[PDB]
Every structure is written in structure tokens, then in C-alpha cells.
Design a protein around this nucleic acid. Sequence first.
RNA 1: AGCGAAUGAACUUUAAAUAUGUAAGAAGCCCUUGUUACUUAACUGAACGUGGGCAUUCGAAUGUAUCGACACUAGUGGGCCAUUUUUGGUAAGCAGAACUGGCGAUGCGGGAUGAACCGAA
Lengths: 126, 99, 62, 174, 50, 52
Amino acid sequence: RTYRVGDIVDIKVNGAVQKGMPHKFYHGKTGVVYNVTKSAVGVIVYKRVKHRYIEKRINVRIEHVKPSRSREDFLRRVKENAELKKKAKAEGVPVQLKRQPAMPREAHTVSIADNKPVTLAPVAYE
Amino acid sequence: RELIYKRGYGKVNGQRIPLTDNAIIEENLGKYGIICIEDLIHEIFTVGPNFKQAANFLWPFKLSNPNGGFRPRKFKHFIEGGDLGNREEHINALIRAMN
Amino acid sequence: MQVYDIPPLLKDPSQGGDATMDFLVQVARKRGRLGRGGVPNIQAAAMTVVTDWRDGRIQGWT
Amino acid sequence: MGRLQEYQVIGRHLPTEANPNPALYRMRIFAPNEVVAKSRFWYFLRGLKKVKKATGEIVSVNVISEKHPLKVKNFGIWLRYDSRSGTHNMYKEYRETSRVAAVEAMYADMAARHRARFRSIHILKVVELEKTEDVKRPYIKQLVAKNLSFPLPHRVPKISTKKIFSAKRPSTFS
Amino acid sequence: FKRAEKYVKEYREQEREKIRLARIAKQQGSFHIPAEAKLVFVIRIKGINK
Amino acid sequence: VQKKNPLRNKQIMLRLNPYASTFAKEKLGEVKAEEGKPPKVPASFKELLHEA
RNA sequence: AGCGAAUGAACUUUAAAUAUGUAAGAAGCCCUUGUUACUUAACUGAACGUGGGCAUUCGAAUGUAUCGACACUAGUGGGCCAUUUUUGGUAAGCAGAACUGGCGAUGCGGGAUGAACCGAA
């Protein structure tokens, strides 16, 4: 794998390599690359102190830094929204572009026939 | 209806103004087609496109302590004899007691 | 009114002039053609009404 | 536990493309109200099988009114309470006019004699004794005994607590 | 005035509509599942400590 | 200068909701239900309640 | 959960709870075309320049008594207790970390009474 300076990378910390291992607070985190070296990579990652945030700088190497899979959703959303707006303007119809919070379900009916409800006990005896 | 009528206060330029006039209602919510307290009640009860605006305009209701009191120990969940949590339709009696 | 719900309009001064604006506001509210801060999109409501009339979703004859 | 009501609750797993039309499970719950009935229902379903509240919906809640509230009758209740040692089975008999009254007296007796709570008691089954001679417990069979007629000796009369001073000494023969 | 007339009519129509659908399912031997509530009133009643 | 609850000051009720007068006059708060003989409850439904 | 799916916590279609990292446009995207002092077999990358679209849903919800910058100006830089998690040890004590909460600068009702309890400022 290859890394440029400025991309988002995840930190997993495998146990195979012991040289330059980051801390368990840094295990399984996400940061941005700000230095690239021969084998290690400089990453700026936030760390939490009481009320404020402080950005620490840590050197984690290639066997445990992997590219992040976060912003692909943002790219897919912008492309899909652009294309959908193109079809909307072309066809003269309005299309909903924002994301909804998955509103609660509506009313519906279910038929007892072929589905005789089975009575159950607090504990199953059989 | 009782919450909007009895303790209805709107946020007018950051000021808690009692909702004593349909003119005030129209001046604050005219852009969304709400021109009366009945319109506001309909929006809230049957949530519509502008429920966000209606709720944000409505000031948080400052309810009184319930008449008759809470249950003997109110700091448990409803299902275990307390008052915390989701009481579903009994919130109506709770509002009757507090309002 | 039956097709688009449209609770009764305020016809305002005169007739037919600003009732169109009220009609567009109500149609945008019903359909869901709201703006950024909730302001109804009168242009969107009007174009939807025009498309519905063209497609025959409303009745009318001479 | 309070003025109870018997609720027939039917719930189901949420519909899926792979598995539509679930089996629509049902239970009878003694709860003070519908919200507690639904909570009990989901607890029992998650305790038994994998169906949970997030992945299911309650399709029906109904009240089961006692068929003949004006008839005194005999109930046998099979219970499994949990104590410090473990789960213990019992079968207790009661004399009431309704299933909810039988369950209320059941809970009162359990709390009084074995310190068993609502969270510790599991109501496995309740049955009406259709015919006599199905009574096994002396404390019900004595009431079932033919031609029962007893006095009520040493009746303390109801004197109002606000009448502190009495001129005549009470009598306890009424 | 006219709009409030309409709103009251709508309220009654919704109530009797729900009741009628429940009865129709009951008579057809099915259960109509009520639509989940969309508005909730939340009252904070506990002080902010711990 | 003095907020008045309409439910106590019906005059404020009249001011805020003009429909209240005709509501009270025509008695929409005690409207009779529609007539017609109700259908009987299914025996299967009764057995379902009295199943266990 | 299934393994009437394969294979066998190290099984998996699926998939928890639970807290915990990153992103959710206009200062944003994409690719097109060129230079370069850098880089690569090579606008392959990096920056610098063009182009386009979409401003009345500009692309989740809620909150909105505003936010950003520079300059200048005092006092402070101790800990104690407890929840949960975690590590080690004893016969039992206990000892060490991380989070949060409370007291530290806080009056009031209750636990007969009270630095560490409950409610509430």
C-alpha cells in the first residue's frame, strides 16, 4: 500500500510487528497523514482531555495503517444527488434530495387465516 | 389544545411573548401559512411540513407540579411502578395533573 | 379542492390576483415543495399544477 | 400487583423479503395496564426465543373479561418462582370470582409467605377446577365442604378513630 | 372561521376512520395494527445532578 | 397586560377561535354515532380470546 | 441464530448489546486541458491555471442569548471520596491505572445527628 500526505487512514495495530507500536488509546482510531517516511507514517489524531480536544502527532507504520473507508459515502452521495438533480431538471419533476430519519411505520392489517396464533408459556415445556 | 391555549408562549425575537392574538401568530408564522392558534394546534397534533418551525417557535412549556402528586416512588420506570420512561397515552392524564 | 385538499383560501383584496399566490402556497405546503427555511416554493407548486393540468389530473371544459 | 387486567397480546416479527408472514405469536399477560403487558410480552419472547422488540411489532392487545364475574369458583395456579437457591415449582389453590382476583390473591400470598416478588414470580398456568374433588388443598376443601355454617366470634365493632372517648365499654358480640 | 370548520371535520373523520378500520378488520377476522404515534410530549421531571 | 386563559374567559375563546360559538351552538362535542345494527363478533375471535 | 446454508471464540448467510474513532458541499465535486522547481514508464501523483452544473429542499435530525482573529491584562496551577471497567495480591486486608460524578468557591428539605447518603439549587 501507498499513502500520500493528507489522506485519511485508520489505525488497527496488529500484534505481529512490535516496532513503533502506538498506544491502546490509539488502537482502532482514525487520523490524517501529515508525514510519510521510509516505513512509518506521521498522523495527526485528536485526543480527548476533560472539556477540550488536543491534536497529537503519532508515527504509525504501514503494516498497521490502512486507508480509511469513510468519505466514499460522501462522494457517492454527491454524485448521486448531482445525477438525480440532472434527471429532475430534465424531466421537469421534483425529486427529494435529503436523507430522512426513517419515520415510524404506518398502519396495516394481518390475516389470521393460514396463521393461527400459537399460544406460548413463560417457559417452554416440551 | 390545552397546552397551547393555557400556557402558550412564542419566541418573538428571542422574547417569550404570550400567544394572545392571531395577529401575533400570523406575524410570527405567516411565511409557513400558519395564521391562527387553531392552525398551530393542527400542525402540532397532526405533524406537517412545518412542524420544525412550529415547535421551535413554541417556547418550552413550564409545567406545574401534578395535582395529587406523583406515584409513591417516581424515580423508577413506569413498567415497574415509577414515573420515568414512556407512558404512552397516560401522558394525557399526566398533563391534566400538571397543567 | 377535493383533488388538492387546499383548506379554504383567504381571497384577500380583489379576487383572482393574490388568491393565486395563496393557492400556490397551499399547494406547495400540501405536496411538500418547501424552501430552505420552510418558505413554500410557489414556482414549484405552480409548475406542478401546470403539469397536472396538462396530464389531465384536473377536470375542465368550455 | 394492583388492580390487574388480563391481556391477550399477539405480536410478530417484522416482515422481511426472505421471510414474510411470521407465525404471529400470542400470550396471556396479567398486568396493571397495556404498556406493562407489552413489556412483559417482549420480556418473555426475548427470554424464550430470539425475537426482540426492535425486530417485532405488537399486532393485537385485547382485554379478557371474566366470563362470569358473579360466580364464586375454584382456581388452581401452577407457578415457578425463583429464590436464592433456584427455580421451585408450586401449585396453589384459591377461591375467587375472577381470574384477575385469583392472580392478585396469588401474588399477595406469595409475597406474604415466601417473600417472592413480581420479578421473581412466573405465572405458568391458571385453571378453573371444572368439577369438585379436583381440590387437593385443605384450605380450599374446607370451604368446599358440604353445608358450611360457622359463627364469627370476637367481632371488634367499628368505632370511629375520631371518637377518642367512649362512655360505655364496647361489646364484642356482633 | 371556515378553515377551523374544516379542521374539526378532519379530526372527526380521522377518529371515526380509525374506529371503522378496526371494526372492519375485526369483522373480517384479522387485526388492524394501529399506525405508530408520530408526536410525543416529553417532560423533564428530574433535576440535573449526578 | 394580563394573560387570560380562554377556557375560563370564553370571550378570549371567541376572540382567538371564532368557530367556538357555532361549535357550542350546534353541539359537535356530543355528536351521535352512525346508526345501523352492529355485526356480531366472530366465534373464532371469541375462541381466540378464550383459547388458553 | 443457523449449521433441514457450507465449513469447522478461532464454524459462518446474517447479526447483536455496549460504549468508542472519521465524514455528511458552494471554503464542495468531478473529470478536461496545459506548466513545473518536485515526482513517476507516463497530468502517474502534487501545486498552479480553464470548464461545467446546481443558489425559491445548497443536499440528515435537533439545538441557535452567535462565531472566528489579533493585541493586551489578573489570579491559578492541591487533592479527597465514590460508580463502572481493568491489572496484581493476600487468610483477610489492599495496591495501581482510565472514565464519569460529587466536594473543593454552594445556601435549602430529609436520613434522630454528621466532608462523601437521597431530592433540589
